[PDB]
Structures are given as structure tokens and as C-alpha cells.
From a paper:
XPK is an enzyme present in many microorganisms, primarily involved in substrate-level phosphorylation to produce AcP.
On the other hand, Bifidobacterium longum XPK showed no inhibition by ATP.
Residue numbers in the entry:
A (entry chain B), B (entry chain A): 2 to 807
Write the structure that this text describes.
Amino acid sequence: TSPVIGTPWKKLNAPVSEEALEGVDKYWRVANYLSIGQIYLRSNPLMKEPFTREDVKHRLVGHWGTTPGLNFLIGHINRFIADHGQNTVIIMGPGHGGPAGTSQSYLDGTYTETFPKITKDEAGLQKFFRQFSYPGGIPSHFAPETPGSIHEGGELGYALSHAYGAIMDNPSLFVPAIVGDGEAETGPLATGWQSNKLVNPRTDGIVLPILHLNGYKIANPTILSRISDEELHEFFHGMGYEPYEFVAGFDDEDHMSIHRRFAELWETIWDEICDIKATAQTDNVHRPFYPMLIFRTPKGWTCPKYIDGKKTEGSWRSHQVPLASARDTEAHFEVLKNWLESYKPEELFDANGAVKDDVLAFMPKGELRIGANPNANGGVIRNDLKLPNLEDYEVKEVAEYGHGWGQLEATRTLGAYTRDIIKNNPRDFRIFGPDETASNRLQASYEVTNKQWDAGYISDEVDEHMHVSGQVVEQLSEHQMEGFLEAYLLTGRHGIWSSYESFVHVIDSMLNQHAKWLEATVREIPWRKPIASMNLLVSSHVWRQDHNGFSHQDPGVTSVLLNKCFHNDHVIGIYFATDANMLLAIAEKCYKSTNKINAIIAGKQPAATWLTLDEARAELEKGAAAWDWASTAKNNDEAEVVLAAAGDVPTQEIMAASDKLKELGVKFKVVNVADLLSLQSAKENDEALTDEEFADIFTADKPVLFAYHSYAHDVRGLIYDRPNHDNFNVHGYEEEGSTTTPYDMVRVNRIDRYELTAEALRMIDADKYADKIDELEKFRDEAFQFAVDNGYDHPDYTDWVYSGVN
Amino acid sequence: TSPVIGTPWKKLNAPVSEEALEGVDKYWRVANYLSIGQIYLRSNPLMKEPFTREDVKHRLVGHWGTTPGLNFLIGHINRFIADHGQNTVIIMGPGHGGPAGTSQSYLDGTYTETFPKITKDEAGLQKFFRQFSYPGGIPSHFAPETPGSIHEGGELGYALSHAYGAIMDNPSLFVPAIVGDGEAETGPLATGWQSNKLVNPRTDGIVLPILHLNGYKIANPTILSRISDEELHEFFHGMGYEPYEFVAGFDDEDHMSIHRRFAELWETIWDEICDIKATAQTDNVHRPFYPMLIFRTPKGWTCPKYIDGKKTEGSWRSHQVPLASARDTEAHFEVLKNWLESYKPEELFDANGAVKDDVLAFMPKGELRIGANPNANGGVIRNDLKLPNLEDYEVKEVAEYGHGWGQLEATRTLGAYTRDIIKNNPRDFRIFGPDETASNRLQASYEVTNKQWDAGYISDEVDEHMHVSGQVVEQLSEHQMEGFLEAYLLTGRHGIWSSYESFVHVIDSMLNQHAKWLEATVREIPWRKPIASMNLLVSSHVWRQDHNGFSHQDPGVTSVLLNKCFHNDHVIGIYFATDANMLLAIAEKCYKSTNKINAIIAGKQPAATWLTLDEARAELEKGAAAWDWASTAKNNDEAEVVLAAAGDVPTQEIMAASDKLKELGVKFKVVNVADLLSLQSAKENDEALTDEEFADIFTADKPVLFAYHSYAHDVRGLIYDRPNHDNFNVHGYEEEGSTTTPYDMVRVNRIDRYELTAEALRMIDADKYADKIDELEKFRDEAFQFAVDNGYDHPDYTDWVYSGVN
Ligand SMILES: Cc1ncc(C[n+]2csc(CCOP(=O)(O)OP(=O)(O)O)c2C)c(N)n1
Ligand SMILES: Cc1ncc(C[n+]2csc(CCOP(=O)(O)OP(=O)(O)O)c2C)c(N)n1
Ligand SMILES: [Mg+2]
Ligand SMILES: [Mg+2]
């Protein structure tokens, strides 16, 4: 449960004191000085004479175009938090403005507790300057290593979705989301603007989107800054926002006047926020107009105006680093020296190098600090879910009528399980889906909650199961759901989100970024506590896209996911749900897990059920297991072939092929691989099953016929080192598909039961079984011709049921 | 060069005749009848008695929620084209409305020329009805098999970028881009709205975005339809559009009145289009307000109102298929029969089943038809580029001073080459880049063209190289560039686009879709002529992300790309530019190629040059080649190890390791793999090099040490079948990185020269070379400590130059 901190939504009811604004100005100066020292300095932080080119870093790496504006905003936000005691977490959308965040963490004090070696004196200042973007130091971007960070910012376009996710079910949290004007050009952010139609002011917090309209991208102006101001205000007001505009730094106005003006504007916007919050207590049915700030400043606002006769301040030339070589020429070093002295550090630092007390006297303290805020470190907030007992949802007909019984839809069991999880954990668990929950048969959750929808309502005939507050969020944008869920987990909550398989690639970048957030966390960041796992239910897979066809059949998500399994981080888990019971075991494991990305591939089509819950759990605790009941060989030596499968449709095809093989006297073994990553090399992955266990499951001499869900490429690239890998004959998706009957789909990919039977015969004796192979190959064509002639699959294919059903 | 067709931008200067609107109404009726027959009917197309449940398809597959609105729009657009003779290509954003497009193709006649077996009579009508979404038929979506299609519509959010790309450098082309309201929620489309700031009305065509605001997604209402109309108009006017609104079908108004009203509204919008075009001839500096149409209609507009007491028309329940089982119950069959008879097909079809002449008397003819428009079939327009002679750009210092000379930046040579290509081919070649052309060192193109930018201008100090018309387009959105380039190629033009490596994943979906467009084209669509290849210059790769760090280091693009190499389609090419000359050869091959996706991975960092242009061409014509000069073994038998590399940084590390090995007397071979797909299995890929050639390059017994750019997983999954695959020891990216010196980057991934030397020693004799291995492993740590202490890489690492430089 998200905690309430301080006194949320209080109006100041007084003008901002002059001492507070003096503190803000001194903070801005000292923060800019630290941001410059990090990029350029390495030694002699206080410029004690002699200050020479020796003290400049050899390789100048970093960004400065956005840093001073971020320092300005952060200083004013710090004054605001100190005055009001608001629960605040800052989303820094331009993550390349890393020095701003690191400077804030150093100034508020949190960086010293987090890293004790960086003291608050001259030596600590020297280390702090040196370590930025340094070999063995800290990253340039606003990184997980930085206290008070929940958004990396490497990628662009996910600041707004992250802010809105952070405020969901968090009524007392205020999130100022700083957005780069160039970042606003990205596709994800343009639809993230429209995310105020899915949050309720009473049940959720408040997001204040601060558009950092500095004018330029890297070597390019931004579209937003160059269109007319009337167009900008009209555009923002068309998306349910009330635009306020602040303009500074474009003339010779004194800095203290700028601080006064921003104080007044900020207090006005805060008054509208408090009015919205107070209104939401009584009326929360009709959507308000959330204010948003348009912050127009020159890029690299405080840097020297001209360098080599080139306009630097207020241009794109200041994005990465002005003074690209301040160590190679004397004129550049003099420019840098004057730039550093312009902030007058002699009055900002005491004799010992500590920032003077009166500079930070206005700073917030305790839990209120951005660095120490719990919503930044979502691990400490996180509490484990209350999970319903699993046997309540087990499919018991398997244990009575035998394996392979029925035509159940696999995902409905997960739907019921998640419904009861929501029932036990309201306001703490949430389901996302890009318009596809009902298609993924997860609608069982609607019995205990509603779809959160804050746009207009028209009629009851079409608005079933929607409400202003709910635990289900839908919007046709995978970026929205991914960002929402990542932010939701990063703040300490839990959730799951489901999608079509081919469309998960839309968020291939996003997943990667989260993986990078986890890999960085597990390796070198002990103080960042574990967060809940990100659960992605991939459904409506390639093998059953009847209505859509070729455009919707892309199983390549696994190929992307495997790229992130290195160095025993275990941040990735890929699970294949053979049936409903296997799905239950997988989901239970995933919901108990932490610091992982769990992709559960389950089909929504009517499929048989093979395992009991105990059997499924036993298979899952190893990752792959031999089905003793399905096999005909009592020992490894007897088997003439091993049929291994991963995925529901491949499992069905393998079992159907096994039935035909059993009529021919073939001794074969049957293996099901629930978890893909268990097949990884033992010495590479300690959690992966050992080579001895692998050899026990797959005998060395016996050929192995593997039927796989995704492309065979990723499996073959995974088992290269394993014993008997050369005998594996993997059959996977082969980029063949259309709108056609289910038998045709598996036929054109050579994964059907008849082709699998012919393959298993060929690994034994093509010469002995030549006639049978000819008959099977003829029958494939005859069955396809039957589907063409009569419009549906063959009675042989459709009516087939396993011989073990009682 | 894009041709001029008909009489572009003519005002009608007369009211629409009543006979034309009668024709439009009859067209709408017959098109809806055909769309229903495709989804439901299997036989007896004209409902000749007896009409029973036998004639209904067993498996009802398709979409109807968007079909009638598309039929309405297409009928009115057809009347418009017939009246004005405009050059028009329709982008159908809701691609799931396939029956609309197929019905249009059948009605205008083009489908009969394209597929002669589908005659225009009762038997042809029966075949046309049966083949939709059928085994051995045609896909459900608006597919490449459908004449007059350039956008699949499978994925959502790329209609606007495709339209804007289609109109670039096409002054006479008018593109009505139909956009689904649910599709407008997607991230790519929200930023595609802002694409009118990058097109010039004089030099480009006109896009008319038709927002198909039918209200609902699948089982969910849309955000756009539920916000207030004032908000909608304000939002669209804030993005430089003039919104016109049409509302129909929500009451009992007669259909003919709806047709009259839409005729008047369409003519008004066309008058504003013609005014904009006429103005652009004299003044094209200031941006106009392009009109856009908001088309509010009930979803599944003409279907029965209620089915099972559930609101079907005007709801989300009609998205895929109303009457989900019209074959299983008599009441459902009666509902379907009445639905079919409501269109009165008895007067729309003659005795022989041909659509009556007076129904299509208003139709356009010849090249003007949407099916027969050349801009739909971009292959016939396409003409080969005028390529400058290659030796003009060869780096000649290699042939004089020896291999490995210099510190040139690889991509600058490509910059000069593309500059001269633009010079020879203006208005036909175009460069795209998500704000990264100057970072990718492609700015040499600015000497002959400008960045196209139609937003406001402020000053010359910051607006260098921008102009209202240019051959370079920049906007911080990879979706924009990918869609622009795909549409540009699909209409017959050529282009290239460059990007950071980690961010190509942002368009992982888009690439896949284009691959699907190509694979479908090469296999079964002969009448679709080849289009220009899509060239993606991947630069600023993982090994040299000094400023950004861990967030920007993701080489997984190759893993996605390999998933699309099946069945000898050869739609994918991955090339690794070792140096400038190799890059020139690669680019020449790519620019001459057709129907491919070519990913050229070249580094922007200062790197040595190894090959002459003839040598690079010789290596490229095989894909992998043995460097005879670098090797020490004259024959395959002598070598104790083979050092193979793919990529510039891996090549540098391999050569540096070879220099250290040569001092120890080791006989080794050196191999460079320019093209990855040449390593694919010979029997799988006919273009891939044979197993005999592979064995010649890599001897069977000798161990092979492979240094790879991307993850080792994809390489190992590619060479499973090849001889001596078990001896390969691939070293690739291992998810280790930060902001640090270049030596550290390759050190933490165990791909540096010292680790490679130790590895190559270990494949020979760990026991003999134990002391040398210990010394190398100590030296790695000492060199990293030097970088930590002094801030830059070791003099041993930095100052090293190949021993073959004269
Ligand atoms: C999708 C994407 N494309 C490109 C980049 C490379 N990049 C890093 S920072 C940056 C510029 C950011 O522009 P803007 O939003 O204007 O930021 P600011 O001016 O505040 O630095 C770019 C393009 C990226 N991070 N993400
Ligand atoms: C990114 C993405 N997510 C999901 C889908 C699945 N899908 C196919 S059609 C469709 C509904 C389209 O909605 P809308 O734009 O309102 O279309 P219309 O009402 O005209 O059918 C969806 C969600 C998709 N094609 N692309
Ligand atoms: Mg900016
Ligand atoms: Mg719609």
C-alpha cells in the first residue's frame, strides 16, 4: 500500500518569503557550478590557485544543454516541497541531464548516506567531480545509481506514461514530469499526453507535465518551439490541459526577478492543483483541466554566449558539451575559467569546501527529500501479495478422466486466479492491456472491478464494466501499458499486462530499458531494494490467428528476450503454458517473484489439458520434465527417438504424433520444456539445469525431435554447448501463414502431426519406413485438399483425442 | 521520377449531378452486399432459391465494424476521381477492413485483370465470395495481393506517416488517409499528426487525413470519440489542421440525403485544397492549414440494430463479425437473410450476376482507377539510380602506405558518396534520420541539399542548412522516418535512413511488417514489380557510446533481423562495414539492390582502414574472405588457430591480437565476414556459401576464434549445421557497459586484444603458454587501473598501429 507522507495538497496562503528565494538563487548557482565541475573538472574543485589545464578532464563527456534548466526547476521544486511538505517524486524526462540529478542528490545530502566515501568537503567534492562519466565512476544519464531516480531517460518518450503510472492508486503523490521539447516529438510521448483521460483525481495523484521547451534537439530545432504560441496553447488545451507559460533567460532581466516570477507562477498553478484535489473529494465524475507548465528557456542557459564566433547559448551547439577541447588550447581554458568564476563559487563554499549552510537552509528534510522519498525506492514500499489457494482453480478433470481431456481455454483459469488476487488485493494490484483483455479471455476480472475510464459516458448498452475508478486500464497503445506497468512496479505495487504476441515487438525498446534497469540494479546497487516482477501474458499466439492472418503472426518476442540473460542476473524468465494447470503454476511462481521480466506464453484457443497441478509444479521446478505416462520406453536405452515440445500447439502436435508412432511399435520418450532458460549452458547460468540432468532427460546417442513455438534459431543458439545438441532437430515457426484453418497453419510450417511423424520415422530408418512415410506425406496433401473443398479441417485432425482419456 | 496523371487540382465549379449521387448510392449498396457475401457466403451468391444454411461458410472469419464506412468513403472518392481526374492513392489505415478494398477492386474491374479466373458473372462472384479468408484464398486484411494497396494495415499507427511519405516529392498526388479512431490512440499516429510541418505544398502533394471516428475499438470506446467536440476541434486546430466534421447514420435520415450532404462537404474541402495548391505556386514559405475530415458514423453502420437483445450497430459488438454463428441456428440464419435482402441485390445485379452497368457508370477509367494507379504499384514507376563512379571515393592511402593506416571516420566516405548520388538524382533520392544525421557524420550531403523544415524560422545563427524544400528530413521519431522511407520506396523512389543502433528496436515492429510485405510479394505476387531496397545505416554502435552509456548500448537489432530469412526470399541483408572501402562496396551493392532490407552496420568513430576497394569488393561477392596478407600460415594445414571477425571494432581487436600472436610464432589464419547471412546453412539458403567453401575458409580440425559485433547467440544459432561449428568460440556483446574509455568497453565484454590473445593461446596449449597467459591477464587489470588513474586508455592500447603500415 502506498503511504501518505507529510500534508498533501495544502495551499500556502502567503507570499513566498524573500529568504526562500535568496536560497533558491544560491542553490541554482551552486548546482550549476557542480554540474560544470562534474563535466569538466577532475582535480582542484574549488579553483584554488594554481588552476591550470592539468585539472581539466582529458576526455570531456556529458551533457549541458538541458542541465541549467533542470537545476532551476529542481531548486524551485525543492523550495516548494520544503514549504508545503508535499509528497513529490520527479520524473526527469531528459535523462541525459544527469549532472542535475547528481547535483541535487549531493546537495540535499542523500548522496552522502548512499555513498559514504563521497564526503561533504574538498576531497569529497574532488571525488564527486572526478567520478562522473569516468572509468569506474557513475553513468552520464540519470541512472539507478542516482538516489531519487525511477526513470532512466535513456530512451525518449516514456516520461509521461511513467509519471501517470507512478500516480495511479497514489492519491497523495505529486509528480512533476519534466518533458523535453525534442522528446515530445517522439511517438510514445504524443500519445502519453492523452493519458489524463485514464486517471481519477480522487483515487490517484496529480501529474504536472513541465514541457522543457528549450527550442532545440541535437543540431536541430524542435517542432513545438517553432509553431505559433496560439497553436501551442490550442493544442495543449485540446488534450484536456490548462497551459501556463513561463519565459525567462531571453533578455537581460535579473535572476532574482526571474525567481520571484517563477515563485508566483508556481504558486498559482499549485492553487489550481489544490482546487482540483479539493473538488475531487465531493465530485470526481467529471474530468477537470489539469494545468501544465510550458517552460521556455535558452538551451544551456548560463553558458557563455559565443564560442569561436558561434552562438552557443540558446542554440543546439550547447547540447552535449561546449568547449569541446578545454585542455588543448589556452583560449578555451580561459573561457572555461571565466565560465566557472561567473557563478562566484568563492561565496557558495566555505573554507573546507562544504556548501555553506545558508545556501541549503531552505532545503527539505527527512522523508520529504527527493533522494530519500520512498516512492523513489519502490522496494521498501513493496509488500508481498495475498495469494488465494491454488487448488481452488486446478482443473480436476485431468486427475479423473485422464490426460488430454477436454477443450478448455487456457487463459480463463488465469482470469479467475487474477480475479481472486484483485479481490484479496484491491488498490494494490492492477491489470493493463492494449484493448485486448476481453480477446485474451481475461474478462473474469470484471466481476470484482471495472475498467477505469474518465472520458465521457453515453449509454449503458455500450459502457458495460467501466467506471471512473477501476483496476483495469485499456488504451490502444502498447507504450502506454508498458510505461504504466513499469512505473506501477517501480513505486512498490504489483500488476500484470497481456497482449497479442506479434505486437509485443512494439515495446521491444521499452522491455530492453527495463532489463537494463534490472541488470544495473542486481549487480552494483545493493541499497535499491527488489521490486515486483513485470508480468507479460502473451496470448493469441501465431498458431491461432484465424481472423487476422499473416500481419499478426510474429513470434519473435523470444528472440529479443533471450538477449538479456548474462552473468547470473536472472532478470528474464520465459515460460510456456502447456495447459491450464501449468499456467497456474507459472503464474503463482511469477507473482511471488521479484526483479524479473516474466513472459508467459499461453494460448486463448480451446486446447486439451495434460498435467495435474502437482505434476505441473514438479515440471516447473526443473523447467523441463519427461512425461512418464506418455512415453513407451521404460528406460533411456530403449527409446529410438525423443519427442520434446514447448508450447501448447507444439505439445498437441507432439502428442498426436506419438499416438501414430505407438501404433507402429516405436519406442520413444516424451519431454516437455516449460521454461526455456533452463536449457541454457550450465556454466553460463547457474540456475539452468546441469549437463548431467540434461543428459538424463535427453540421452546422448538418441536423436531428439524438438517442436518449438518460436523460431528454431533461438533454441539452436541456446543449446550449442549441451551434450547431444547435434542430434536436435528443431521445428519452429517458419514465416508461413495466412487466414486459414488451424491445420493449414501448422502444415505450412512443417510442424503438423503427420510431418512430425515422418520426421521421427526418418531419424530412425527412412529405408524401413519408406512406404509409411509416403502414405503420411500423401495424407498431408489430401487433408489440405479436404480443407479447401469443405471449408474446415479434416475429421481425422479435428475429432482426434488422446488415447489416454477415460 | 513520379509521373503527373490527369488534371491535378481542378475545381469542379458546378454542383454535383444527381445521376452521380444515384450511382454513388447504388455503389455503396452493392459494395456492402459484396463485403457481406465475402464474410458469410460460400455458395449461391445471388440468393437464388433455395438459399439455405448450406451456403453459409462453416468458419465465419473477417471484420465488419469498419467496412461500411470505408465503402461509403471509397464510393464518394471514386465519384470524386471520376469527376476531377485527380491522381489519387488511398491509404486505408484500418487494414482489417479488407472486404472494402477487395470489393472496390472487384467493382472497378482491376481485380479481373489481376486475377483472370475471377470473372464478372455468377461463377466469378461465387469464387470471389468463397476465397475471402479461406484456405488457399486471400488474406482478411488489406493485403499486397489486393490491387491498389500500399499499406497493409496489420499494424496500427503508420497510416499518416505512410501517406506523408507517399506525397513527398509528388506534387500531383492526392492521398486521402483514412485513420481509425482507435488507431489514433497509438503512439506512432499521435506523432504522425505533426507531420504536416515537414512537407511543402508546392513541391509535395496533399494528404487529407480522414479520421474514421466510429466511436469504438474492440470491446472498448475510443478516447477521441468521447471527449467534447470543442476539445476535438481545438486539438486538431492546434496541430495545423482545419477540422471539418461530417455526421451521419445516427438518425433516420434518408441515405440519398446523406450522399448529397457528403458531396457538398467534400467539394468544400476540395475547394480549400485547390486554393492551398494554387497559393503554393506563388507563396510556399508560410505554412497553410490543411483541412482534415472527421467522419462520425455508427460502427457497422448498415448491420441489424439488435442481435440477441444486444446493441450491435453503433457498438463494439460489431467489430469482427455479428451473427457469430449463422449456420448453427435458424434464427441467426433468418437475421442474416434479412440483412442480405435489405440491400435489395435483385436490382443491383443483372440476370448473369454481373453488376448492372448503371451502378458503375460513374466509375473512373484507365490509369485513374485506384487499382490501376501507378503509385500503388511502385515497381513500374521505379527507375534505377544514376550512380557516381566508385573509385572517386576510394581511400587510396591503403594501397600506398599499407593496410591498417590512418584514423579515418568510416561514415564520411558514405556521406560523400550519398551527396553525389543526391547531386545526380535530385527529387528522386532522399535521406531520413531521427535527428542524428550530423552525429552520424552524414552532413556532407548538406553541400548539395538542405533539411526540409516548414515550421517557423527565427535566425541564421541556428537555422543553418534548413529550407522549405530539401532532400533531408529530420524529426525525433524513428516511426516517422521508417514510415516515410517505406512509403517513399513503395511509390517508386529511393532513399536511405540512418540511426543509432540501440534505438532501431523502436521500429522492430515496422521492419517486421515491411519484411512481411516483401515476403508476401516475392512468393505469390508476380504482378507487383520490385521496389527499391530499404537501406538502414546503423551507426554509433555499442562499442563507442562514450557520451551516453549503458542506456544506449543495445546491439540486438541483428537478432530481430535474422528471424526473417526463410525459403530463399532473401529479403534481409546484414552487412558489417570493416572500413571505408568495405562501406563503399556495401553501399553500392545496396543501392543497386531491390526488394530487400539492408542493414549496414558502420562505426562513426576514428578507425583504421584495411582493404582496398577491389579487395573489399572481392570479399563482398563471397560474404566472407581470408585475409592472405594478415595470416601467417600459407596453407590451411599449418594454422593452429583461425581468427575470424565481423565488425570494425572486432576487426581491430582481432588484428591487434594477431600482432601479439605473431611475436610468439603462432601460425594462424585471419578471416573477415562482411555479410552475416553467407554463414547460413547452404541447403537452407541457396545464396549462402557452400559447405565446401566454408570448410576451405574454416578448416575442419582447426579451432576458430570468432569476434562478433552483436550477441554471440545469433551467430551460434546460424552456424549449427556447418562443418567445424563445434570448434567456434564466439565472443560478442555481453550486456556490460557504462560511460568509460573505449578500452574498458571491450575489456568488460572480454573482446579486447589481450583477452582474445589469451583465448587463442588456450585453444592451442594452456599448459605451454601458462606464463604468457598469466602475464596477459595481469596486464588487462593493469591497463584498466591505468585508465582509472590517468583518465585515458593505456599508451599501449592507444598508440598501437598495425605492423603492416609503411
Ligand atoms: C528515441 C531516441 N532517439 C534518439 C535519442 C538520442 N538522444 C539523446 S538526447 C537527445 C536530445 C534530446 O532532445 P530534447 O528533448 O530537446 O532535449 P534537451 O534539449 O532538453 O536536451 C537525443 C536525440 C534518444 N535518446 N531516443
Ligand atoms: C498496435 C496494435 N494493437 C492491437 C491491434 C489489434 N487490432 C486489430 S484491429 C483493432 C481495432 C481497430 O480499432 P479502430 O481504430 O477503432 O478501428 P475500427 O473501429 O475502424 O475497426 C485492433 C485493436 C493492432 N492491429 N495493432
Ligand atoms: Mg530540448
Ligand atoms: Mg474505430
